[PDB]
């Protein structure tokens, strides 16, 4: 079978980003030893090790949706993957408010209509599971108390 | 990948011709080939040669021994008593395969000397110097020597290489296959007043030491085959093209202004073919030669084309400009894709013929409009379906018999019937249009550009074929290039329309379900006829309802019969709104004839002609009238005209009359509506109210406002009312009285059209309009009422036919003093005299046509007179006229006339196999078997025509009328 | 001697997806999307592997791929120059659609959930619409990507200024204005597979404005929906019959039940009723063999059955169905069947749209709202 590839964005500190950029544009396999990525079983925490120097990482959710688009002739572009996550290196904490481009900043706060995002229903499932541990329940619409 | 069938590879060939003697019809020369053996122990080398007397052969300046035998001179033995045609077809196929250079074989077998075996085993070069002589060639190179006295340039004598396919063996020894590409060096020592035109570019022209002769040196660095090498030696008037300067036009003397006007369009043809393809013209020069007594009307060789002079017209000649224009266009299309890119086998010929015909159709589309393109495509498709339902089918790309339903073998081009060759090219270009329908036109032009670009990178290398075989296309290479540029492969379409040899027949009938608002089509195929095959693909159908035109795709599997498609509203009958058409426009329709319950106005099964099909749809007559009036497709208007002949109601007469009155209709639809209106008018006699059909319309369109019976003076500058004006009395003369006689109101009208004709004021000639007037006079002739076989004399002539006979006598005699452009009035008057003889009016005497069929007449007069003699010997069962025609087949100077006599005697045979005739002797069977076996051994087109004539007359088995 | 075809009275006046996309191959076009996969529609989470090199816990080296990029580009240029030098079609395999080769750009979307969105493997074009200045103009400001076209009639709702070039994504699904921005200086692109991590840099990222839909998303249980549902199942059944190696082409029912598990088996059996029969005993037992009279359709007929854009419209409908269902009439107006119908009707001139409303995907004054309002 085929499994859709999972692309994400890695953001590094600027000096470490310059060293990683120079090693990527060089193209040797020396970069492979220099740059490693360890993702912790939390799922939202990691280490990125640049030149064997550990950096602390968080996998965050991006407010917009990006899409990688490949081309062969630079006139027709084929969508390859959807990007929604970023492993910035240096819950509410795992949500990024700003977008990657310069015009998109505080997008979540200002350029997003506040219909809703998501949590409430997982709690409902847990509540129904607990409810089935009952024979008599008492409920009262309440006031200030 | 191309691997040679020959064990040697030919690199270079020198063809030197000296001593072209026009009095004795003789050439002397030599040929020097430069071969590299690919296999050691080459020993014999087998070359192709016909009609050349081989004097000596030297290999590497050492004297070698050759043996010559041609098995195609006498195909079967003289003392074999076989008389069936399958025996001759198998023996003729075996004889042509025994001289085939596409196998290893050949007619001249040269033995390598012994001391060169150590030169041939370690593979080194061999230079073979043959010197030869053509003593008096029969069909090798045509000598046209007129019998005026003077020098040979003063009388207009010339030579040209004639023949089709591999026929260069007829004038020098070569490897006469399309796959043996080599570079060329051509020298011709001609008279000082003559010019020698050939392939390549002329590097120099040196004088001889007496300055009475000069040698033309040509060099061809683009590697061509021997079959693409030509020659034209004559006293030609040279004209450099004033627009493109590498193009020179050669004509016969005194025809320079006609050449200037005729070849003035060709730069636009060059510009078209170089902008749809992106390759420039591959050769360094282009030469158009116009000659007399041509083999075909247009032949295309490498960097050269040979047309007949009968294409040359002046500025005041219309009805000949488009025909000559498209002959030039298809010669240039074959320059691109028959001579530069060549064939790899005899299979893969459909590729080249299809690309040539397809790009010539694209030229016709841009030049003459899409409507003329659609009309041409429909007439070619009707031609193919008529031929394939008549006899078997045309098989593009056979595999080596693959087609055993016909009477000849399709393994070689020189065993094909000429009608099969014509239908082969026709089907090839229609299948290429189908490949364009599946894979879009820009990808198709990219395929052609990729083939041309591979060939032009190949054409500049010097390696002896290490890359020169990229100039040869195959079927697998063509399909691979298609799959490279598009990503789709066409292997189902190739498997259906190329490898399978059949067309499809569709019988459709509909029914509208009012309850569920659906249209139930019923499409059944006739797949048990001899020419047919079964279609299982998708099928487009276009339904015009009141809400507009909608396309539907139907999947027609083997077990399918009823196809339910959905129908739209009928709310454009509630309000009067305009009904939108196939294009973006909308019109007002008179919906009084339409059914109240059905919204659908017409249905068209396969509108885009996306299959090779013959449709028989059963609409209602009002749907055919709506499709004739308001359709924006010319093929649908033509098929509605064709289907309205079965419905003679007055609404159909009103529909065709509204089509005839309508400018902004395509003119070839109105020209068909004339004949359809004539047929409908003949069928509703004793109901017709007013005047005869189209007469009031002719006086409304083409006559004076103050005088109805006087025609306007001729101004032919519109070119659509000219064609309609010259076609309307020809259809009007097919009107018939209740008594089955043409009315004296239409005959008098045609005679007044003839009398009041004034052409002193237009800038165009009147020869075609007057010739069509004679054709209209010939159409009015009904069979005479002879009593007791009374001898037809001058006193008991019809009072109607005396006026017709006076007019055609006046026209023919005035043609004898003031001739027309191509003796069009002679051809029309001979045709009309044969019409009067076919009925009981003029005595049935062939002496007039036998005097017009002599050698010194123009070739159109000759073929019209010979058509009249063939019709006479069919009707009067004349033995001596058939012997006259067979003698004229055997010894006539013009070979095109011999081919045309065999063609006309095949089309209108004196007897068929079913008939008992007095002309079915053993003597006639022996004459025609001798004409197939010997006698026609020099042309390859007379022999296939004799095979066709023997098949038409006696069939595939043993002639029955024999011991 | 002239035209003579009255053409003005008879005739008065492109996107090629990859071969995995036009053949509707499973990974790229899923047969069934559950609720947790419809909530993560076009936002696929980073899955943990069970087997492979990345499935073992620990640090993992990323691998540079610049010899791979230039080797693949040189190889594709050799293929193009061997095929005559024209433009070629390269995306013929699923392994052509990797991010490891070719010139990648990124494309960010302004709206959270667009009405239509491309699946993986589908193609789009970049068109640079350039309105010339009144009278003399220098020429279109040249742009690195796309082809330029001179638009007198603005494709979008507004009209272009004189001398204004606007780039746009153009395909069969939508048409949307895009804006080229340079990438941040810190962000790289990590392509992870089962074997390891790979890193590219990115330099070009477009921001995609509000889409102008060119395809109508069907409603739940509509006519288009009804057709697509059974057509997609029929195409999957035909492609399972083509993949069958046994000469009597035979399939199993629980392969189709694994692909379409929400389907009642009466519908699957209805699709198999014509074109197949069930063998209970003997050879081919518990298999659905193909009927001997049935001609299995060719590849182009199966491609003509269902289009990839219809699959994208169906995926948009079922994702919006899930989002509306999770959130308990304003929201119903913002559903893509309503907004796509409104925009396409506005483009024919049927009706007008209130450009300020609640269907506004921004939630502020920026952006349009595609809901129908009267012409008069």
DSSP structural state of residue B416:
S
Residue of C nearest to A119 (CA): C326
Check CB contact under 8 Å for C298 and B492: yes
Question: Could you tell me if B258 and B232 are in contact, meaning their C-beta atoms sit under 8 angstroms apart?
Answer: no
Distance between CA atoms of B705 and B709, rounded to whole angstroms? 10
DSSP secondary structure, B746-803, as one string: HHHHHHHHHHT---SSSSS--HHHHHHHHHHHHHT-PPP--STT----STT--HHHHH
Instruction: Enumerate residues preceding breaks in chain C (C to N > 2.5 Å).
Output: 13, 328
DSSP-derived secondary structure letter, B687 = T
Residue A11: closest CA among chain C residues belongs to which residue? C187
**Cβ-Cβ contacts under 8 Å, B369 against chain C:** 3-5, 7
Nearest residue of A to residue C49, measured between CA atoms:
A3
Q: Examine chains A and B and say if they touch (3+ CB pairs below 8 A).
A: no
Where does B620-756 show beta strands of DSSP type E? Answer: none
CA distance A64 to chain C (A): 6
Q: C297 and chain B: CB distance < 8 Å anywhere?
A: yes
CA B883/CA B885 separation, integer angstroms = 5
> Is the CB of residue A8 less than 8 Å away from at least one CB of chain C?
yes
- DSSP letter at B645 equals G
Which one of B322, B538, B666 has the shortest CB-CB distance to C301?
B538
**Cβ-count burial B720-745 (b if 16+ within 10 Å, e if not):** bbbbbbbbbbbbbbbbbeeeebbbee
Q: Name every chain A residue with its beta carbon within 8 A of the beta carbon of C186.
A: 11-14, 17
> Is the CB of C60 less than 8 angstroms away from the CB of A36?
yes
One-letter-per-residue 3-state SS of B157-194: CEEEECCCCCCHHHCCCECCCCCCCEEEEEEEEEECCC
Q: Tell me the H-state helices in B263-348.
A: 266-276, 321-334
- Set of chain C residues whose Cβ sits within 8 Å of the Cβ of B663: 6
Distance CA B327, CA B311 (A): 9
Please check whether residue B800 is in contact with residue B752, taking contact to mean a CB–CB distance below 8 angstroms: no
Q: Do residues B637 and B581 lie in contact, with contact meaning Cβ atoms separated by under 8 Å?
A: no
Q: Which residues are CB-contacts of B552 (< 8 A; sequence separation ≥ 6)? A: B540, B541, B542, B543, B565
Task: List residues bridging with A69 in a β-sheet.
Answer: A79, C105
Minimum-distance CB partner of A32 among C64, C186, C366: C64
- Give the separation between CA A116 and CA A94, rounded to whole angstroms: 17
Q: What one-character DSSP code corresponds to residue C87?
A: -
Q: Do A76 and C120 touch (CB under 8 A)?
A: no
Interchain pair A121, C42: CB under 8 A:
no
C16 contacts on B by Cβ (under 8 Å): 487
Q: Which residues does B196 contact at the CB level (< 8 Å), separation at least 6? A: B188, B190, B216, B231, B232, B233
Q: Residue B924 and residue B943: Cα distance in Å, rounded?
A: 17
Pull the structure tokens for residue C94: 């699923």
C-alpha separations of B959 from B81, B618, B903, B921, C159 in Å: 12, 44, 21, 10, 83
Distance CA B733, CA B782 (A): 11
> Residues near A136 by Cβ (< 8 Å), separated by ≥ 6?
none
Beta strands in chain A (DSSP E): 6-11, 35-39, 46-50, 53-71, 76-89
| Of residues B68, B62, B162, B146, the one with CA closest to residue B106 | B68
Query: B249 by DSSP, 3-state: which?
Result: strand
Asked if C83 lies within 8 A of B485 by C-beta distance, the reply is: yes
- Where is B659: in which H helix or E strand? helix B650-660
Q: Tell me whether residues C19 and B454 touch, CB distance under 8 A.
A: no
Q: Which of B327, B210, B201 is nearest to B262 (CA)?
A: B327
Neighbours of B179 (CB within 10 A): 22
Minimum-distance CB partner of C46 among A67, A70, A85: A85
Is the CB of C4 less than 8 angstroms away from the CB of B484? no
Between CA C235 and CA C227 the distance in angstroms is: 12
Instruction: Check if the beta carbon of residue B807 is closer than 8 Å to that of residue B777.
Output: yes
Smallest Cα–Cα separation from C365: which of B560, B147, A110? A110
Structure tokens at B29: 């020369």
Q: Which residue has the tokens 């499994």?
A: A3
Residue of C nearest to B478 (CA): C83
Chain B residue with minimum CA distance to C11: B583
Place of tokens 């070689």: B412
Strand order in the sheet with B213-224: B62-63, B53-59, B126-134, B26-37, B8-21, B182-191, B213-224, B201-207
Find the Cα–Cα–Cα–Cα dihedral B291, B295, B299, B303, rounded to 10°: -50
Beta strand B182-191 pairing with B8-21: parallel
Cβ(C112)–Cβ(A61) below 8 Å? no
Question: Å from C65 to nearest chain B CA?
Answer: 28
* Distance (Å) of CA B544 to CA B374, B513, B594, C215: 20, 16, 13, 25
Interface list for C 13-32 with B (CB within 8 A): 13, 16, 19
Which string of DSSP letters, residue by residue, matches B84-152? -HHHHHHHHHHHHHHS-TTTT--SEEEEPPGGGHHHHTTT--EEEEEEEEESS-SSSEEEE--S--S-H
Min Cα–Cα distance to chain C from A6, Å: 6
Residues 1-40 of C with CB under 8 A from A: 15-18, 20, 25-28
B783 Cβ neighbours under 8 A, 6+ residues apart = B839, B840
* A51 Cβ neighbours under 8 A, 6+ residues apart: A19, A34
Q: Are B879 and B918 in contact (CB under 8 A)?
A: yes
From the CA of C3, how many Å to the nearest CA of chain B? 5
Please, which chains are in contact with B (at least 3 CB pairs closer than 8 A)? C
Experiment used for this model = cryo-EM
- Discontinuities in chain A with C to N beyond 2.5 Å fall right after 90, 118
Q: Are strands B231-234 and B195-198 parallel, antiparallel or unpaired?
A: antiparallel
Of C10, C83, C304, the CB nearest to B450: C83
Q: How far is CA B837 from CA A109, B701, B784, C247, C368, in A?
A: 102, 35, 10, 70, 85
Give the separation between CA B601 and CA B585, rounded to whole angstroms. Answer: 16
C8 burial level (CB within 10 Å; 0-12, 13-18, 19+): exposed
List all residues 6 or more positions away from B530 whose beta carbon is below 8 Å from its beta carbon. Answer: B389, B392, B405
| Contact list, C295 vs chain B (CB under 8 Å) | 536, 557-558
d(C-alpha C144, C-alpha B475), whole Å? 40
**Chain C hits for B451, Cβ within 8 Å:** 84
How far, rounded to the nearest angstrom, does the alpha carbon of residue B955 sit from its chain's CA centroid?
26
Angle between helix axes B942-954 and B85-98 (nearest 10 degrees) is 160
What is d(CA B954, CA B962) in angstroms, rounded to the nearest whole number? 11
Residue B780 contacts residue B746 (beta carbons within 8 Å): yes
- Polymer length in residues for chain A: 145
Q: List all chains that touch chain C, counting a touch as 3 or more CB pairs closer than 8 Å.
A: A, B
- Of C82, C81, C320, C297, whose CA–CA distance to C222 is shortest? C320
Chain B residues with CB inside 8 Å of C1's CB? 318, 321-322, 719
Q: Which helix (H) or strand (E) element contains residue B45?
A: strand B45-47
Give φ, ψ of C135 to 5 degrees: 60, -130
Is some CB atom of chain C closer than 8 A to the CB atom of B610? no
The answer to whether the Cα torsion of B167, B172, B173, B176 is positive or negative is negative
Distance CA B885, CA B949 (A): 13
d(CA C243, CA A142) in angstroms, rounded, equals 64
Query: Which chain C residues contact residue A11 at CB under 8 A?
Result: 184, 186-187
Q: Residue B604 gets which letter from DSSP?
A: E
Structure tokens at B461: 């290398």
Rg (CA), chain A: 22
> What Å distances lie between residue A58 and A35, A61, A96, CA to CA?
17, 10, 10
């Amino acid at each position: 079978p085929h499994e859709l590839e999972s692309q994400f964005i890695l953001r590094l500190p600027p000096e470490y980003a310059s060293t990683v950029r120079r090693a990527v544009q060089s193209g040797h396999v020396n970069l492979k030893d220099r740059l490693t990525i360890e993702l912790h079983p939390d799922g939202r925490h990691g280490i990125v090790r640049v030149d064997r120097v550990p950096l602390a990482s968080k996998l965050v959710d991006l407010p917009c949706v990006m899409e990688s688009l490949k081309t062969i002739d630079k006139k027709t572009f084929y969508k390859t993957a959807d990007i929604c996550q970023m492993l910035v290196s240096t819950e509410k904490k795992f949500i990024w408010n700003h977008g990657i481009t310069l015009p998109l900043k505080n997008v979540r706060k200002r350029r997003f209509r506040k219909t809703a995002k998501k949590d409430v229903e997982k709690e409902v499932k847990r509540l129904l599971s607990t409810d089935a541990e009952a024979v008599s329940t008492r409920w009262e619409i309440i006031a200030e108390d | 990948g191309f691997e040679s069938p020959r064990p040697y590879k030919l690199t270079h060939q020198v063809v030197c011709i000296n001593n072209i003697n026009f009095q004795r019809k003789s050439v002397v020369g030599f040929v020097e080939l430069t071969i590299f053996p690919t296999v050691a122990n080459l020993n014999r080398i087998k070359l192709n040669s016909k009609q050349c007397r081989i004097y000596r052969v030297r290999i590497n300046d050492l004297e070698a021994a050759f043996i010559y035998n041609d098995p195609t001179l006498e195909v079967c033995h003289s003392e074999s008593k076989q008389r069936n045609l399958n025996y001759f077809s198998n023996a003729y196929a075996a004889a042509v395969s025994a001289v085939d250079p596409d196998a290893g074989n050949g007619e001249l077998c040269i033995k390598v000397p012994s001391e060169l075996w150590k030169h041939v085993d370690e593979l080194k070069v061999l230079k073979i110097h043959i010197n030869f002589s053509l003593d008096q060639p029969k069909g090798g190179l045509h000598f046209v020597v007129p019998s005026v006295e003077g020098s040979m340039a003063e009388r207009g004598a010339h030579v040209f290489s004639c023949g089709y396919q591999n026929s260069t063996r007829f004038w020098f020894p070569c490897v006469d296959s399309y796959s043996e590409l080599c570079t060329w060096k051509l020298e011709f020592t001609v008279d000082a007043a003559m010019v020698a035109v050939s392939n390549g570019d002329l590097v120099e022209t040196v004088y001889t030491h007496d300055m009475r002769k000069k040698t033309f040196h040509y060099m061809l660095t683009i590697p061509t085959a021997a079959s693409n090498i030509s020659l034209a030696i004559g006293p030609f008037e040279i004209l450099v093209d004033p627009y493109m300067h590498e193009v020179t036009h050669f004509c016969l003397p005194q025809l320079l202004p006609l050449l200037k006007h005729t070849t003035s369009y060709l730069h636009e043809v060059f510009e078209f073919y170089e902008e749809i393809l992106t390759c420039r013209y591959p050769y360094s020069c282009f030469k158009t030669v116009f000659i007399d007594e041509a083999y075909v009307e247009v032949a295309a060789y490498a960097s050269m084309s040979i047309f007949s002079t009968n294409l040359l017209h002046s500025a005041m000649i219309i009805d000949e400009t488009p025909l000559t224009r498209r002959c030039l266009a298809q010669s240039l299309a074959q320059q691109f894709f028959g001579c530069f890119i060549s064939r790899m086998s005899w299979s893969d010929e459909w590729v080249l013929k299809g690309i040539s015909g397809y790009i010539y159709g694209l030229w016709m589309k841009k030049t003459f409009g899409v409507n003329e393109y659609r009309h041409w495509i429909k007439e070619e498709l009707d031609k193919i379906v008529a031929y394939e339902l008549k006899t078997g089918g045309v098989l593009l790309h056979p595999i080596f018999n693959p087609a055993s339903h016909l009477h000849f073998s399709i393994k070689h081009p020189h065993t094909l019937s000429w009608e099969y060759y014509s239908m082969f090219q026709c089907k090839a270009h229609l299948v290429m249009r189908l490949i364009e329908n599946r894979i879009s036109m820009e990808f198709m032009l990219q395929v052609f550009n990729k083939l041309l670009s591979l060939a032009s990178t190949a054409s500049s290398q010097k390696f002896q074929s290490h890359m020169w075989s990229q100039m040869l296309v195959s079927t697998s290479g063509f399909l691979k290039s298609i799959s490279n540029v598009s990503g789709k492969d066409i292997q189902p379409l190739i498997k259906q329309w190329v490898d399978q040899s059949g067309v499809v027949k569709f019988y459709g009938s509909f029914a509208f379900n009012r309850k569920r608002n659906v249209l139930e089509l019923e499409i059944k195929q006739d797949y048990t006829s001899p020419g047919t095959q079964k279609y299982v693909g998708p099928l487009k159908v276009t339904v015009q309802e009141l809400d507009g035109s909608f396309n539907h795709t139907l999947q027609i599997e083997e077990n399918s019969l009823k196809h339910d498609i959905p129908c739209h509203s009928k709310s454009r009958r509630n309000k009067k709104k305009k009904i939108p058409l196939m294009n973006g426009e909308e019109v007002d329709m008179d919906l009084s004839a339409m059914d109240a319950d059905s919204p659908l106005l017409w249905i068209r099964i396969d509108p885009d002609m996306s299959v090779l099909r013959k449709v028989e749809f059963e609409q209602a007559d009002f749907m055919w009238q709506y499709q004739l009036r308001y359709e924006r497709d010319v093929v649908a208007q033509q098929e509605s005209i064709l289907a309205l002949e079965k419905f003679p109601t007055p609404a159909s007469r009103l529909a065709l009359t509204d089509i005839l009155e309508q400018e902004q209709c395509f003119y070839r639809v109105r020209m068909s509506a004339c004949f359809c209106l004539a047929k409908i008018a003949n069928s509703m006699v004793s109901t017709w109210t007013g005047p005869p059909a189209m007469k009031s319309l002719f006086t409304r369109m083409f006559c004076c406002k103050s005088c109805p019976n006087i025609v306007k003076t001729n101004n032919f500058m519109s070119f659509q009312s000219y064609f309609l004006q010259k076609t309307m009395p020809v259809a009007m003369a097919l009107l018939r009285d209740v008594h089955n006689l043409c009315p004296k109101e239409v005959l008098t009208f045609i005679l007044d059209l003839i009398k009041y004709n004034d052409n002193r004021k237009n800038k165009f000639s009147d020869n075609y309009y007057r010739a069509e007037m004679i054709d209209a006079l010939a159409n009015s002739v009904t069979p005479a009422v002879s009593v007791n076989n009374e001898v037809r004399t001058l006193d008991n002539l019809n009072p109607d036919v005396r006026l017709i006979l006076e007019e055609i006598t006046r026209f023919l005699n005035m043609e004898k003093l003031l001739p027309s452009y191509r003796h069009t009035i002679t051809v029309s008057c001979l045709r009309a005299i044969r019409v009067l003889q076919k009925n009981g009016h003029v005595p049935s005497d062939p002496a007039l046509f036998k005097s017009y069929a002599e050698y010194g007449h123009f070739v159109d007069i000759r073929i019209a007179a010979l058509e009249a003699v063939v019709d006479y010997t069919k009707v009067d069962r004349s033995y001596e006229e058939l012997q006259w025609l067979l003698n004229m087949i055997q010894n006539d100077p013009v070979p095109y006339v011999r081919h045309k006599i065999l063609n006309m005697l095949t089309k209108n045979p004196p007897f068929t196999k079913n008939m008992e005739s007095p002309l079915c002797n053993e003597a006639l069977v022996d004459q025609l078997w001798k004409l197939m076996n010997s006698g026609t051994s020099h042309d390859w087109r007379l022999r296939c025509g004799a095979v066709d004539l023997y098949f038409t007359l006696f069939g595939l088995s043993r002639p029955s009328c024999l011991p | 001697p002239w035209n003579l075809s009255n053409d003005e009275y008879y005739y008065p006046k492109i996107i090629q997806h990859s071969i995995p996309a036009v053949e509707l191959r499973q990974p790229f076009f899923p047969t069934h999307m559950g609720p947790i996969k419809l909530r993560q529609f076009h936002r696929p989470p980073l899955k943990k592997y069970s087997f492979g090199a990345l499935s073992q816990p620990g640090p993992h080296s990323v691998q540079p791929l610049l010899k791979h990029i230039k080797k693949k580009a040189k190889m594709r240029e050799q293929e193009r120059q061997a095929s005559g030098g024209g433009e070629m079609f390269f995306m013929r395999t699923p392994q052509d659609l990797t991010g490891k080769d070719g010139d990648l750009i990124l494309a960010e979307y302004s709206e959270e959930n667009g009405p239509l969105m491309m699946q993986v493997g589908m193609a789009t074009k970049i068109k640079n619409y350039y309105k010339r200045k009144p009278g003399k103009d220098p020429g279109a400001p040249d742009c690195k990507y796309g082809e330029t076209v001179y638009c007198h009639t603005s494709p979008f709702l507004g009209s272009l200024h004189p001398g204004q070039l606007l780039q746009a994504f153009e395909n069969n699904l939508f048409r949307a204005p895009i804006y080229l921005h340079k990438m941040p200086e810190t962000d790289f692109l990590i392509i992870r597979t089962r074997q390891g991590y790979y890193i590219r840099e990115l330099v070009d990222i477009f921001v995609v404005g509000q889409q102008c839909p060119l395809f109508e998303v069907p409603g739940p249980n509509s006519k288009r929906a009804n057709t697509h549902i059974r057509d997609f199942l029929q195409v999957f059944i035909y492609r399972l019959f083509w993949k069958s190696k046994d000469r009597p082409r035979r399939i199993r029912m629980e392969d189709i039940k694994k692909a379409f598990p929400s389907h009642s088996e009466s519908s699957i059996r209805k699709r198999l009723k014509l074109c197949a029969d069930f063998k209970r005993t003997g050879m081919d037992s518990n298999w659905w063999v193909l009927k001997s009279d049935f001609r299995l359709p060719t590849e182009e007929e199966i491609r003509a059955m269902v289009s990839p854009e219809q699959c994208c419209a169906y995926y948009s409908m079922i994702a919006a169905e899930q989002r509306l269902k999770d959130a308990g009439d304003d929201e119903v107006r913002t559903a893509p069947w309503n907004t796509t119908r409104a925009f396409i009707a506005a483009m024919k001139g049927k009706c007008l749209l209130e450009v300020t409303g609640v269907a506004d995907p921004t939630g502020c004054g920026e952006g349009f709202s595609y809901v129908k309002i009267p012409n008069k």
